[PDB]
């Protein structure tokens, strides 16, 4: 067994969190945050949630931590909890996530309104005066 690969990844996650938790030179703390996020995406992908792991790796790292780095630069045991059967001829995670449009109408409505209000709030705050 691969020396508890899930445990190895979890320990590396904790090590990265400790590294960036000391808050040294916020750019270096950011770099530690990218390392920890990559390790977490690895954990999620290894578990079986491919879409959610790729979702983290795209949204979090590519957009949000990139905006963080942009703003900073502008300034100065396992394997036993698993299943037994099969998923059929589809991926359960993808079906559950795609059920957002047919089932979660309320969630879509509230999230869209929150995002629009977030746009308005950002404009109002950064307007200045």
């Amino acid at each position: 067994m691969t020396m508890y690969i899930a445990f190895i990844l979890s320990t590396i996650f904790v090590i990265g969190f400790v590294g960036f938790s000391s808050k040294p030179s916020p750019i270096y703390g950011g770099l530690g945050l990218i390392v920890s996020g990559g390790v977490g995406c690895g954990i999620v992908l290894n578990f079986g949630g491919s879409f959610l792991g790729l979702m983290v790796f795209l949204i979090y790292l590519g957009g949000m931590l990139v905006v963080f780095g942009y703003t900073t630069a502008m300034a100065t045991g396992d394997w036993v909890i698993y299943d037994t059967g099969d998923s059929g001829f589809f991926s359960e995670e993808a079906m559950g996530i795609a059920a957002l449009y047919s089932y979660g109408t309320w969630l879509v409505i509230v999230t869209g309104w929150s995002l629009l209000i977030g746009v308005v709030v950002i404009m109002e705050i950064t307007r200045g005066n």
Binding site: S21, S36, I43, I81, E92, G104, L107
Partner: protein, 98 residues
């Protein structure tokens, strides 16, 4: 309760302690908040996928979205602070006091 969940909660606690320590550089505080959020995302994803709670697969994505929005908001505030002081040291926010 396996060791993976224990390690994830340990990471969340470490990030919370880092947020509450407050050496300087409010950007580090925002980074600690987002580390806590990432730990929350990982833990929720593992819990939901483990139990095959299909309809709950929506929960992480939604979470992430909202949290990222908050991050954006926070950044805006940080910018204004710098634009008033020239730098983002935490100790500069001492005009208001108990």
């Amino acid at each position: 309760m396996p060791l993976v969940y224990m390690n994830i909660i340990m990471a969340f606690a470490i990030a919370l302690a880092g947020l509450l320590m407050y050496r300087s550089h409010l950007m580090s505080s925002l980074l600690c908040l987002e580390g806590m959020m990432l730990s929350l995302f990982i833990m929720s994803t593992l819990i939901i996928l483990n139990t095959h709670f299909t309809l709950a697969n929506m929960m992480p994505i939604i979470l992430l979205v909202f949290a990222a929005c908050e991050a954006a908001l926070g950044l805006s505030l940080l910018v204004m602070v710098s634009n008033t002081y020239g730098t983002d040291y935490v100790q500069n926010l001492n005009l208001l006091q108990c």
